Tab-separated table of C-alpha atoms and ligand atoms in Angstrom:
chain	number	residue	atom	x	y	z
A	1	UNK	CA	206.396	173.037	154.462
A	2	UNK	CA	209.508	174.345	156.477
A	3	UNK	CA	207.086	175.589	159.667
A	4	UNK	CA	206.564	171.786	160.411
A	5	UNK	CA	210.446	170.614	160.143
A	6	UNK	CA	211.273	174.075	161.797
A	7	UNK	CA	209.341	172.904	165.275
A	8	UNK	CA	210.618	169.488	164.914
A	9	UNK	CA	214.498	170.855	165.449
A	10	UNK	CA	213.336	173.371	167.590
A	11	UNK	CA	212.157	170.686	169.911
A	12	UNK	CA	215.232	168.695	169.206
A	13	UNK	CA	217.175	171.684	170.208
A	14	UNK	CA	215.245	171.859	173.836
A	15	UNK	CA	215.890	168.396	174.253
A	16	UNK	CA	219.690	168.644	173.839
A	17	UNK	CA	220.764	172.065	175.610
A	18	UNK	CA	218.150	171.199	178.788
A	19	UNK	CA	220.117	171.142	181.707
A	20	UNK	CA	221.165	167.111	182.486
A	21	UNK	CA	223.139	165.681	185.094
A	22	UNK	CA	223.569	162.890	182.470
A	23	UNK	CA	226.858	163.467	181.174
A	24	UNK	CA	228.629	164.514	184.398
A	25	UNK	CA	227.959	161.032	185.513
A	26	UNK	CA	229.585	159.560	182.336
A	27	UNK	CA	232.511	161.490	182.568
A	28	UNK	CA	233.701	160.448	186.381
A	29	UNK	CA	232.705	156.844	184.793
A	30	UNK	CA	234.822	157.228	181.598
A	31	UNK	CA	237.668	158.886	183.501
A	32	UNK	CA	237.964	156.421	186.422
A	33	UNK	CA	238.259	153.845	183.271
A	34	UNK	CA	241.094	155.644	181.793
A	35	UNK	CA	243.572	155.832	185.118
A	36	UNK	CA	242.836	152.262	185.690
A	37	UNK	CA	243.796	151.077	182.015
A	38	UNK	CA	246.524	153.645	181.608
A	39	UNK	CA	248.016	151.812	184.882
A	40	UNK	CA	248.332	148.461	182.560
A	41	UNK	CA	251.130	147.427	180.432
A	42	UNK	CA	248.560	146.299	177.301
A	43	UNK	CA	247.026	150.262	177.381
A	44	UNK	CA	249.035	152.507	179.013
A	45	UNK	CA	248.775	155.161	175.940
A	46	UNK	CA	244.992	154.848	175.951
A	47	UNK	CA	242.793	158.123	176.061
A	48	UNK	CA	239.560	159.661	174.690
A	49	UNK	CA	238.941	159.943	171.158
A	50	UNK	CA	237.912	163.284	171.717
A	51	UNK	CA	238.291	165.697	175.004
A	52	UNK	CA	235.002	166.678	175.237
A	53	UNK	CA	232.904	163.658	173.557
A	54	UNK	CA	231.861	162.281	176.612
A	55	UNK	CA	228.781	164.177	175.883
A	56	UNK	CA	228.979	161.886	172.233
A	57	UNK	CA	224.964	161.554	170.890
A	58	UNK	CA	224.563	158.697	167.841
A	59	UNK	CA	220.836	158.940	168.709
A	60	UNK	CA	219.573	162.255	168.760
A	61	UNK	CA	216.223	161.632	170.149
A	62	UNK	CA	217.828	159.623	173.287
A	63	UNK	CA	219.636	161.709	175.260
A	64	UNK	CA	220.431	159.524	177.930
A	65	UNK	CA	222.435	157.404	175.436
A	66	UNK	CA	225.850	158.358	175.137
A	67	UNK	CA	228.915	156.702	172.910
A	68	UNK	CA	232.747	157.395	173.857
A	69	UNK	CA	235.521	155.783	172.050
A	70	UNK	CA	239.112	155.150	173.618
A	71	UNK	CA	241.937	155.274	171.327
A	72	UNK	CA	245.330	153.490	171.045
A	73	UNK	CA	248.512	154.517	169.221
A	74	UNK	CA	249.998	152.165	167.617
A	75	UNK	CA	253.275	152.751	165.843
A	76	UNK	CA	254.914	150.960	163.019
A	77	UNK	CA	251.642	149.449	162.026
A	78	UNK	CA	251.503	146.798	159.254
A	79	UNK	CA	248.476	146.416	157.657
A	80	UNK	CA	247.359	143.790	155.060
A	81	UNK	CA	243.666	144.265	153.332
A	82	UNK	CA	241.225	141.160	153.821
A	83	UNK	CA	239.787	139.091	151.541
A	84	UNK	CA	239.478	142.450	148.959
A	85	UNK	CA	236.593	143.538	151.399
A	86	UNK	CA	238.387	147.401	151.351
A	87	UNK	CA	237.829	147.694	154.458
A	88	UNK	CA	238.415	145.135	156.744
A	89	UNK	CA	242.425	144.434	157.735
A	90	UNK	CA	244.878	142.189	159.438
A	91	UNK	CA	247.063	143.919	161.835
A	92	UNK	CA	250.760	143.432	161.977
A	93	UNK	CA	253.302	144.988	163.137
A	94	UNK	CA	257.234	145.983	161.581
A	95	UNK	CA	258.224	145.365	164.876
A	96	UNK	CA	260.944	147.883	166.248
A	97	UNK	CA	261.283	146.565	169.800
A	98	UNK	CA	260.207	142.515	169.682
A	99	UNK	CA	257.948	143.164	172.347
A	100	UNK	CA	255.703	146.947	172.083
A	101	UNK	CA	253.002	146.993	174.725
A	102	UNK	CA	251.065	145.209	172.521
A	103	UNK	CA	252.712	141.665	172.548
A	104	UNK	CA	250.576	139.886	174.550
A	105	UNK	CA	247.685	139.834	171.945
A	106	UNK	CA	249.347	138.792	169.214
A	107	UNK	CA	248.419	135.040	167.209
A	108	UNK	CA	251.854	134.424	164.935
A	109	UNK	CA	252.202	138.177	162.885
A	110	UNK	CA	248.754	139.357	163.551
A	111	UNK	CA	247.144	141.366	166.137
A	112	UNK	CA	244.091	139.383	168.052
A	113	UNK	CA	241.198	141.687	168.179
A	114	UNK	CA	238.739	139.420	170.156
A	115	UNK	CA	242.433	139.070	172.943
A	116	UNK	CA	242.438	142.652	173.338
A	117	UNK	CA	238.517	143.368	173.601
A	118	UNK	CA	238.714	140.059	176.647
A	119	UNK	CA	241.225	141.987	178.520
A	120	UNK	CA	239.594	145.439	177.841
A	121	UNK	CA	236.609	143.932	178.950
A	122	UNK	CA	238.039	142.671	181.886
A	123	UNK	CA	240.120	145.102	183.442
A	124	UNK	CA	236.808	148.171	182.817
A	125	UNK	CA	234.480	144.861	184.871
A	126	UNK	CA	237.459	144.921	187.571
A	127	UNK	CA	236.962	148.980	187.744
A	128	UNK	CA	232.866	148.560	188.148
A	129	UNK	CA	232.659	147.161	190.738
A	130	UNK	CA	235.074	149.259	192.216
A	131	UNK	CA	232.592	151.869	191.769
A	132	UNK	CA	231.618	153.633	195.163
A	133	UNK	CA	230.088	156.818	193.093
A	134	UNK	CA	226.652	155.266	191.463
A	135	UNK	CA	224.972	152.560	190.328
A	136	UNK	CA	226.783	150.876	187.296
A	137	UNK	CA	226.291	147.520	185.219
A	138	UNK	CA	227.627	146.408	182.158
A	139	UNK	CA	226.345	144.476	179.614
A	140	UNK	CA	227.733	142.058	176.858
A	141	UNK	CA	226.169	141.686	173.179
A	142	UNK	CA	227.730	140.305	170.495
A	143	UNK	CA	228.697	142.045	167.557
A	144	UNK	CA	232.210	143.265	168.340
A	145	UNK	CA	231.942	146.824	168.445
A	146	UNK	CA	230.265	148.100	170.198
A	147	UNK	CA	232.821	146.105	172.677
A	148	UNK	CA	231.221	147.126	176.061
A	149	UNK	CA	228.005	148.945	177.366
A	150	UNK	CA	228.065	150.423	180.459
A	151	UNK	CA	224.471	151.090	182.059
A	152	UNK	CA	224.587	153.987	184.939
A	153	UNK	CA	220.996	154.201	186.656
A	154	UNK	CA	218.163	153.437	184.953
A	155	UNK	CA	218.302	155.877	181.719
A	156	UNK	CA	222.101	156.582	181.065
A	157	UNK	CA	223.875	153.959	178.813
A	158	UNK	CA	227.283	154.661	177.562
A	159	UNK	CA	229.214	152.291	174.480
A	160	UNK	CA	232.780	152.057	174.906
A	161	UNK	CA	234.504	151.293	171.471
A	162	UNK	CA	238.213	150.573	171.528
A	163	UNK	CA	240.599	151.667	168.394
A	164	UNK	CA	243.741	151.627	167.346
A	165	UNK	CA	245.212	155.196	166.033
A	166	UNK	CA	247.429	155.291	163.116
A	167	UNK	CA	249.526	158.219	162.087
A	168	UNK	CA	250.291	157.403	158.996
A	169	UNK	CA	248.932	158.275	155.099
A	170	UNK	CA	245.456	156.795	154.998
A	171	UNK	CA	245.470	153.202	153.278
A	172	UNK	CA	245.113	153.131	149.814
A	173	UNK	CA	241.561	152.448	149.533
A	174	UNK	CA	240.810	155.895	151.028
A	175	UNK	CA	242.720	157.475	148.097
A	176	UNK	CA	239.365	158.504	145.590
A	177	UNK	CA	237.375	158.986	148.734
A	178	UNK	CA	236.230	162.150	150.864
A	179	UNK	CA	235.279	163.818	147.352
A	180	UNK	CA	234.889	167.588	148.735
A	181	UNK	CA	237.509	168.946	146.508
A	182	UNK	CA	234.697	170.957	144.727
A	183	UNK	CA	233.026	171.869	147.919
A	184	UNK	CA	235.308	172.516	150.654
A	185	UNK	CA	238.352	172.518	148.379
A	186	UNK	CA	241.138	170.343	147.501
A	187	UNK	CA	243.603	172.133	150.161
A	188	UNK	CA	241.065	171.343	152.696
A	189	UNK	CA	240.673	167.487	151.624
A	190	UNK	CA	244.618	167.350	151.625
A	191	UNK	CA	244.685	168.825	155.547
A	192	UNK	CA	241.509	166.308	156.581
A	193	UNK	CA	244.093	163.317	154.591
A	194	UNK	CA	246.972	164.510	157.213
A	195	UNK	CA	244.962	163.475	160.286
A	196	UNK	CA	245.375	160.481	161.704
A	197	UNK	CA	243.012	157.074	160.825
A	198	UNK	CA	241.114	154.360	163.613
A	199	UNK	CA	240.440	150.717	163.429
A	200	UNK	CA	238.132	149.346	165.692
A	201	UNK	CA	236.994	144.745	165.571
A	202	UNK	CA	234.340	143.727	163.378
A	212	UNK	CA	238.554	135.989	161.825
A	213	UNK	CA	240.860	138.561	163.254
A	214	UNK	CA	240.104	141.649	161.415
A	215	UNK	CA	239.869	145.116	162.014
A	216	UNK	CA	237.313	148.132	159.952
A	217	UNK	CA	238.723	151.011	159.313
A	218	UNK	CA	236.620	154.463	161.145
A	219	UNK	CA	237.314	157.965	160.763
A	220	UNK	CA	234.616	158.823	162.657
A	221	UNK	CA	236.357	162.351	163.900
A	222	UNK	CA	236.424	163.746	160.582
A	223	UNK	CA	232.341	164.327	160.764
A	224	UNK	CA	233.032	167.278	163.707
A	225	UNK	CA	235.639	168.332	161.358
A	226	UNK	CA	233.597	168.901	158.187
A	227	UNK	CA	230.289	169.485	160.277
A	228	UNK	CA	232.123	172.726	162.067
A	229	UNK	CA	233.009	174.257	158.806
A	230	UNK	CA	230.789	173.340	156.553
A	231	UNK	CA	230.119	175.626	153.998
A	232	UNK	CA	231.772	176.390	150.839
A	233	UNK	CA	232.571	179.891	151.937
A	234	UNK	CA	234.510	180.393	154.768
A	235	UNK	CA	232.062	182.636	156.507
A	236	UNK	CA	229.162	179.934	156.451
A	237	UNK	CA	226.900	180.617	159.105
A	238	UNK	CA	228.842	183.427	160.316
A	239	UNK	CA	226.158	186.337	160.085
A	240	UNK	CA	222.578	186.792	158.811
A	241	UNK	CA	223.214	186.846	155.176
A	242	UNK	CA	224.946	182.819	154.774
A	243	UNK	CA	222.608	181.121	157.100
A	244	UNK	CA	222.372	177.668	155.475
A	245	UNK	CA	220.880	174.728	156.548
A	246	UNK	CA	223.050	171.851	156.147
A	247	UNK	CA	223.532	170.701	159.712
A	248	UNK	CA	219.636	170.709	160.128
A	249	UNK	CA	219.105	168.760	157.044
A	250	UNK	CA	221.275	166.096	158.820
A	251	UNK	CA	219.468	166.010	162.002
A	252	UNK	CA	216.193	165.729	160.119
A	253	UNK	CA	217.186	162.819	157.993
A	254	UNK	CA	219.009	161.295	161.566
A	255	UNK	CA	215.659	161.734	163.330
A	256	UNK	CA	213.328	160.186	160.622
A	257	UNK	CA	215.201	156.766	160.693
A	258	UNK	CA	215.383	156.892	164.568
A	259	UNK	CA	211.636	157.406	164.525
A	260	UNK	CA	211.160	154.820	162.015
A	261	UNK	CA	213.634	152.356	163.370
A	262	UNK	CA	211.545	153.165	167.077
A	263	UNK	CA	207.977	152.810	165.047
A	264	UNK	CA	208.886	149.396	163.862
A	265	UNK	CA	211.402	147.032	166.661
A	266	UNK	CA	208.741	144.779	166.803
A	267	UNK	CA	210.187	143.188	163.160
A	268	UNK	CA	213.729	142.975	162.246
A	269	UNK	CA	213.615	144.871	158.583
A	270	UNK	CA	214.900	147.830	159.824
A	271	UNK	CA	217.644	146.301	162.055
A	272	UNK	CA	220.820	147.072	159.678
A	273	UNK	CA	220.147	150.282	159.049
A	274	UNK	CA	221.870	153.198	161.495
A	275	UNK	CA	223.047	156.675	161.197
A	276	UNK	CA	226.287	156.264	159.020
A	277	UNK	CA	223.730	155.169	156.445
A	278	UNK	CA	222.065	158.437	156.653
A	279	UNK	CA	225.155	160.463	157.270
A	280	UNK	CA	226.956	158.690	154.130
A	281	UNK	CA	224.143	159.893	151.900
A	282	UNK	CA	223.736	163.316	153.435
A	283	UNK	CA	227.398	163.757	152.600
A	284	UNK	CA	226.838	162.665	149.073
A	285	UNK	CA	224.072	165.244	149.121
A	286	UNK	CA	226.730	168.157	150.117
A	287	UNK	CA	228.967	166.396	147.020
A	288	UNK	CA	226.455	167.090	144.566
A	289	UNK	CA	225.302	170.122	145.865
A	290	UNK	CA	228.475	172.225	146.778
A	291	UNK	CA	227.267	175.959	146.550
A	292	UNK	CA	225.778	177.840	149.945
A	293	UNK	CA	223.639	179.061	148.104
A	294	UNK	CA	221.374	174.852	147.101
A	295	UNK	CA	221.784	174.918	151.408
A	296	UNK	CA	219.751	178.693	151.625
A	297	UNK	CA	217.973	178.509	155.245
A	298	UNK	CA	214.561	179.377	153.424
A	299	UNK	CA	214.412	176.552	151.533
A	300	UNK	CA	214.605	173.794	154.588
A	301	UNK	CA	211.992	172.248	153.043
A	302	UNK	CA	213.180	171.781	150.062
A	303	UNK	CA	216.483	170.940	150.611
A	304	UNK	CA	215.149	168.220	153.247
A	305	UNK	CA	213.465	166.789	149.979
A	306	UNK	CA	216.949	166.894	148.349
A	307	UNK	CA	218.039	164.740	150.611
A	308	UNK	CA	215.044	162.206	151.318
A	309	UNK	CA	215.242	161.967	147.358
A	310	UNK	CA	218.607	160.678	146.760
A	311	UNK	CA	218.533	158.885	150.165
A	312	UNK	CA	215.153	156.764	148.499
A	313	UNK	CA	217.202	156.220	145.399
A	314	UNK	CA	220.125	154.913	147.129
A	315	UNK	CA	217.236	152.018	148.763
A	316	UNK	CA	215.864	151.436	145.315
A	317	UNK	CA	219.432	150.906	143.700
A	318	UNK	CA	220.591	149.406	146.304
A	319	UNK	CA	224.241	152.045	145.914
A	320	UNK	CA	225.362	153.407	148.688
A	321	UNK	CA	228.977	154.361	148.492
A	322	UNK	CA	231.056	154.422	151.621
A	323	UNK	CA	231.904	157.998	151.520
A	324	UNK	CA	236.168	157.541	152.248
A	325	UNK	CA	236.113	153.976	150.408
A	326	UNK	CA	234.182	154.630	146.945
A	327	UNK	CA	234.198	150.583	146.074
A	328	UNK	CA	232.475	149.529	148.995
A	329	UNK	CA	228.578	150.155	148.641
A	330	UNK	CA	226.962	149.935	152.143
A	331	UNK	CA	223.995	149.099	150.319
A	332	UNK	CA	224.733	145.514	148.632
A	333	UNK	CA	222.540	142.534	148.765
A	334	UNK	CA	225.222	140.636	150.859
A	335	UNK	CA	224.894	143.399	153.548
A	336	UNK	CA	221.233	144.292	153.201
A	337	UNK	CA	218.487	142.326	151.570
A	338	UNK	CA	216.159	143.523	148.939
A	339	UNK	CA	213.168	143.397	151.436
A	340	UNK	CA	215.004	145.136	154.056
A	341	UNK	CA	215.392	147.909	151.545
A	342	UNK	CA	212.125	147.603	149.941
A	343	UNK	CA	210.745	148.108	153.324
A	344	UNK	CA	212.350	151.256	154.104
A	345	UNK	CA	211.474	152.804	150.646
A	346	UNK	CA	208.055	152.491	150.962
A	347	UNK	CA	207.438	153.610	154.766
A	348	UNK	CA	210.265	156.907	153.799
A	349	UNK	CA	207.829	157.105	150.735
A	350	UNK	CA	204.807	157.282	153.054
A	351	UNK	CA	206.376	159.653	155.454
A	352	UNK	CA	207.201	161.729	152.481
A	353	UNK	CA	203.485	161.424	150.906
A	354	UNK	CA	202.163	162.317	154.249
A	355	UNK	CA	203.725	165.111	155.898
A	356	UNK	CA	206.110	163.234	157.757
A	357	UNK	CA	204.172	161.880	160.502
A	358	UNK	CA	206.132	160.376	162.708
A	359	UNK	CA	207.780	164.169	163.212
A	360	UNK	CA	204.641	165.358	165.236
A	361	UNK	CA	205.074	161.746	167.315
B	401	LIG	C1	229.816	152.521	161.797
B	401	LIG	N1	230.216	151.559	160.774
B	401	LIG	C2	229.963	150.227	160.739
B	401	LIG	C3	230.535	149.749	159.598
B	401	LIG	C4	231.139	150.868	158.980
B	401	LIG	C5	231.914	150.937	157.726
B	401	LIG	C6	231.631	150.087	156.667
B	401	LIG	C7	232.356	150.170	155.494
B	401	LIG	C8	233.378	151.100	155.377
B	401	LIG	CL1	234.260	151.164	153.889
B	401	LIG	C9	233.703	151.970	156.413
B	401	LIG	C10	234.826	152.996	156.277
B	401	LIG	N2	235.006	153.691	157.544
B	401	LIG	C11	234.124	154.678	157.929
B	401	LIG	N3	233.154	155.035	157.034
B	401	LIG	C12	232.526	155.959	157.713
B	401	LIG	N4	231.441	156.713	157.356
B	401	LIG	C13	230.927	157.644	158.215
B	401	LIG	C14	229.735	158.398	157.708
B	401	LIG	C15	230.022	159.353	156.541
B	401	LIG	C16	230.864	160.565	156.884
B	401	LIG	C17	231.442	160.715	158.141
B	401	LIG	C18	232.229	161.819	158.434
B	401	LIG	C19	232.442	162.791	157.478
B	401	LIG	C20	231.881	162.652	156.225
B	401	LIG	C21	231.102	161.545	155.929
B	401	LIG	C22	231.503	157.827	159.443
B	401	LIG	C23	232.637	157.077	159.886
B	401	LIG	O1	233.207	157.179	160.966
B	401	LIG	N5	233.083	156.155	158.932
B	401	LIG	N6	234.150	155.303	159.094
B	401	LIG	C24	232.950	151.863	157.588
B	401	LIG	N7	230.932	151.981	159.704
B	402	LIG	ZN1	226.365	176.951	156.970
């Protein structure tokens, strides 16, 4: 069955490495943005998440959709857990000089989220217009975060998140998370642990992303050190990821005329992919010959997660992305059976 998925990421791979002016015209955007915030007392230390992600794909069947994420230091950072969600916090600060460049957000000892996106908001709408390069128009949906969407043309569309960057120790919810001690190692969980952590708005509260640790464990991968390195350890981990990415994309395009598919994204998919390389640490369960059936690996547990209704964030263990207060029953019912119909079928919406 690996021929069929084989053409399917071969076409994927045209699709991405075809020459595009696309993100040329996002950086000049995205960097135009950053001199004209940097120039403000509220974001001076603002910068990309990372140098290089202004080519940043979510969807990897639009390539004309791009996501970037601006980042924040902020030191001394006080944070206080809401409500025992896990992952959702009030931001205050210890406070070294009364007034940090952050001041002018702040409602008593905590940090006003929806004050900072206005003024972010703001000062990027004072910088479109400004815009003698190309055509550009931004958009507002609720939601939080994604704060702003910035439309160049008629096919480029770029999200601009803004986060705050912590240096410190990860909070303490993190501390039985990122479980790769048996596949990448322990030493390599306690280096990933020593990077920095985000917060981006989703009541005042802030969510907790480490969304740059995926290039980190993505890029080196494999259990031995020389994963995909010559012709002999050739594993297929990174395809199995685009594969399961692609089939909710397809699905989630297939059926936007209802609504059961609207909570469901990516981090779902990449959450339970991860679990996948948890349970499965060895090269050798990821052998490029068995695409097929390692695909199935993951489709499997994915369809369990539905019918359980578990999903584990994968740096939080306690908070299941899957709950009934998050998703509903139908919703997931509904995705089980059309994954369960793709699987019965030959995945059909790969050939469409
Ligand atoms: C985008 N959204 C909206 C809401 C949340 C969310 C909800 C609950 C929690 Cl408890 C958290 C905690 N924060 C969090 N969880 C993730 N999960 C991954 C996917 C897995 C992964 C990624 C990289 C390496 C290995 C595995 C990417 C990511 O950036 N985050 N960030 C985040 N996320
Ligand atoms: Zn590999």
């Amino acid at each position: 069955g690996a021929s069929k998925l084989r053409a399917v990421l071969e076409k994927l791979k045209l699709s991405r490495d075809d020459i595009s002016t696309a993100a040329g015209m996002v950086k000049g955007v995205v960097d135009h943005l950053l001199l004209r915030l940097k120039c403000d007392s509220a974001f001076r230390g603002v910068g990309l998440l990372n140098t290089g992600s202004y080519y940043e794909h979510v969807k990897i069947s639009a390539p004309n959709e791009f996501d970037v994420m601006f980042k924040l230091e902020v030191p001394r950072i006080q944070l206080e857990e809401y409500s025992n969600t896990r992952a959702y916090y009030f931001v205050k600060f210890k406070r070294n000089p009364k007034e940090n460049p952050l001041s002018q957000f702040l409602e008593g000892e905590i940090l006003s989220a929806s004050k900072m996106l206005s003024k972010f908001r703001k000062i990027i709408k004072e910088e479109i217009n400004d815009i003698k390069d190309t055509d550009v128009i931004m958009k507002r949906k609720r939601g939080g975060s994604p704060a702003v969407t910035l439309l160049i043309s008629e096919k480029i569309s770029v999200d601009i998140t803004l986060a705050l960057e912590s240096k410190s120790s990860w909070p303490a919810s993190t501390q039985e998370g990122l479980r790769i001690q048996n596949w990448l190692s322990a030493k390599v969980r306690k280096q990933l642990r020593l990077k920095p952590f985000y917060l981006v708005p989703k009541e005042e509260t802030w969510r907790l992303s480490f969304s740059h640790i995926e290039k980190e464990i993505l890029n080196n991968h494999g259990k031995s050190k020389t994963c995909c390195e010559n012709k002999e350890e050739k594993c297929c981990r990174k395809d199995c990821l685009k594969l399961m990415k692609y089939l909710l994309e397809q699905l989630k395009e297939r059926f936007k005329d209802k609504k059961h598919l609207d909570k469901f994204s990516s981090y779902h998919v990449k959450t339970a992919f991860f679990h996948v390389c948890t349970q499965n640490p060895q090269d050798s369960q990821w052998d490029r010959k068995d695409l097929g059936l390692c695909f199935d690996n993951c489709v499997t547990y994915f369809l369990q997660c539905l019918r359980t209704e578990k999903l584990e964030n994968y740096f939080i263990p306690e908070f299941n992305l899957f709950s009934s207060n998050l998703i509903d029953k139908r919703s997931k019912e509904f995705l089980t059976k059309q994954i369960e119909y793709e699987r019965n079928n030959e995945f059909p919406v790969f050939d469409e």
